[PDB]
Amino acid sequence: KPQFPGASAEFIDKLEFIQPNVISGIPIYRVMDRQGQIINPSEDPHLPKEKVLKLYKSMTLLNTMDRILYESQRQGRISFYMTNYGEEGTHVGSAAALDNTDLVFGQYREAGVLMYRDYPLELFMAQCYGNISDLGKGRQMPVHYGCKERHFVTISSPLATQIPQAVGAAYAAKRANANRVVICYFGEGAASEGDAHAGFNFAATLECPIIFFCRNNGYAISTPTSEQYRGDGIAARGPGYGIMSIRVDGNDVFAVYNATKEARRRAVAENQPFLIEAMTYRIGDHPISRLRHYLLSQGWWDEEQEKAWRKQSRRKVMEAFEQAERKPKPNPNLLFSDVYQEMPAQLRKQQESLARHLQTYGEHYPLDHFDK
């Protein structure tokens, strides 16, 4: 019997290398088939009609917003845009499974979480336009959303940085004795970063109530997964860290919901991390269609409702979009605040330097576009 503190194991008296099982991977959990029918009644969440309709309307409203802002970007009216196509179900389904005060970290594909939490169209647009209504003060590139009121930590461009951060917020929640979970979204590409190894490992050793939600759509920009990793996706990494793990069909809002709800329940009770890997398709057999088929089978929707919602959502998005374009940008003074909490005197000197310069050379600057 082995007496080594690093591992609990028997001896073996023959030489045998352990092989990965990649061809027969961790199976993909699914609740409803492509026609929206529940496959196994015992897995039906029986979510109420109003909630399931909110899932559907959140997804389609996001998709409407995407269409308009994508075109805005192609025209150069905003400088950058990342769509949510194919990811509407992973985000609305997971968000519905959270408590409203569970803290969310993510990056570029998480706008649907905000949509589900009723973030105003006006504020999605304010950030993308960097206008006076943006609580981010116009400082970040478009789609770098955040909302303190809705517990959605501001997105940053460097990939995977939010992973160990999310773990720290989770540790703090544990200590605060919160009945709170943290969820942290990232893509399969981002999981290659050092910071993902840091986060996964810290979460297990420090016993944190965190859900890791990895979106695996087969690509990171032009890079296919064959060039990203050679194990069985990201889900298979979880066990090597001591992390309970599961893989789900990301086109199935119910599969995502069920996995997230159970992960949330156990994470908060046991102070242990959970990893969910949602398989989706690279688009920018759709989560919106599948759920639509379910709605029809229950008698919860029809073509007149679809047409009318399609029209009402376009109007809501176009009102927000028009208002956002017509607002001024913030005061250029806001370029200097929040670097530190307070403004250092030497930084104030730079601000004063800019004000003097604009007094003399202001005709050469777009002053009419900015507030005050």
Partner: protein
């Protein structure tokens, strides 16, 4: 746009800055069979097109994608170079070089010294898009050269044009020291110039005086050279002031002699860079010139730089050290 781009080695052709990088990389692979190119999304031609056609031409083992992991890209590169093979790593934006900062500063830079020259990674070059772009905000705009300037054992090199880019990149790739080559991304598709088809070199650690002048020395690098060239024109027309315009080119080791020789002549110096003032590389130049040229200085050395903030999205037009900010500082220095 905040800048305007302008203007012996055999046959040339018109090339923008990304095409000139591709031409350098192609020449390098043609003549050095050990050489390989790697990083995120380089195989299909790169997100800025700098590696288009190279994998079809040289093979999938020589032009290839890594996992999404900058610390790994740099450590991987160092390891290739330890064997003597030419390793040309790409970091997708300079903003994302920091995960590799430990591999660069603690490892690559110190590899030769700490082994007594038993081992080295001299055949490593790390190339990366750099500088502002009008709308890149905090993480598509950064100019990190001052962070690297404090690390003995690496070279940091930044061109101003397609012709300069190819010649400097070839010299970095062949230099026997780990080099970081920062490619001003706003120039990648902005005006072509004639670039030799065949390989040539431009020397490292040598500034270029691109315009002689007698009243003031202006120093910058990258895109900012074009800003100061315009400032020189504005000073001539509006003030009758003759400006000596210098492209530093190599951040470290830098060409101290060319800059001091200019300031001994003019007696005035203005240094400009997009990077924040505090700890920016203009402070090293200013201190040094003060030390070497104290008796020649007719006026305090001026630094016209980015503010000490992160690089803003909507406020970029107010952030950058543009031609009016440079002109105004130069006016005041001339009036001192």
């Amino acid at each position: 746009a905040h800048f305007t781009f302008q203007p012996e080695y055999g046959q040339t052709q018109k090339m923008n800055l990304f095409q000139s990088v591709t031409s350098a990389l192609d020449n390098s692979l043609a003549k050095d069979p050990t050489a390989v190119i790697f990083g995120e999304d380089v195989a299909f031609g790169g997100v800025f097109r700098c590696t288009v056609g190279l994998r079809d031409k040289y093979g999938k083992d020589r032009v290839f994608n890594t996992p999404l992991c900058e610390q790994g890209i740099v450590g991987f590169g160092i390891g290739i170079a330890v064997t003597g093979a030419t390793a040309i790593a790409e970091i997708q934006f300079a903003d994302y070089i920091f995960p590799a900062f430990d591999q660069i500063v603690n490892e690559a830079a110190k590899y030769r010294y700490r082994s007594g020259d038993l081992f080295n990674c001299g055949s490593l070059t790390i190339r990366s898009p750099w500088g502002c772009v009008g709308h890149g905000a905090l993480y598509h705009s950064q100019s990190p050269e001052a962070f690297f300037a404090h690390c003995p054992g690496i070279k940091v090199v930044i061109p101003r044009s397609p012709f300069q880019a190819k010649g400097l990149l070839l010299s970095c790739i062949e230099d026997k020291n780990p080099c970081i080559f920062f490619e001003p991304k706003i120039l990648y598709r902005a005006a072509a110039e004639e670039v030799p088809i065949e390989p040539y070199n431009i020397p490292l650690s040598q500034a270029e005086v691109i315009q002689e002048g007698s009243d003031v020395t202006l120093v910058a690098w990258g895109t900012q050279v074009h800003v100061i060239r315009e400032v020189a024109s504005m000073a001539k027309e509006k003030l009758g002031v003759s400006c000596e315009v210098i492209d530093l080119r190599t951040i470290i080791p830098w060409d101290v002699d060319t800059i001091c020789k200019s300031v001994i002549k003019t007696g005035r110096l203005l240094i400009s860079h997009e990077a924040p003032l505090t700890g920016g590389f203009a402070s090293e130049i200013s201190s040094t010139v003060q030390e070497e040229c104290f008796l020649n200085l007719e006026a305090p050395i001026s630094r016209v730089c980015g503010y000490d903030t992160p690089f803003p999205h909507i406020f970029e037009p107010f952030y950058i050290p543009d031609k009016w900010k440079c002109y105004d500082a130069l006016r005041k220095m001339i009036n001192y």
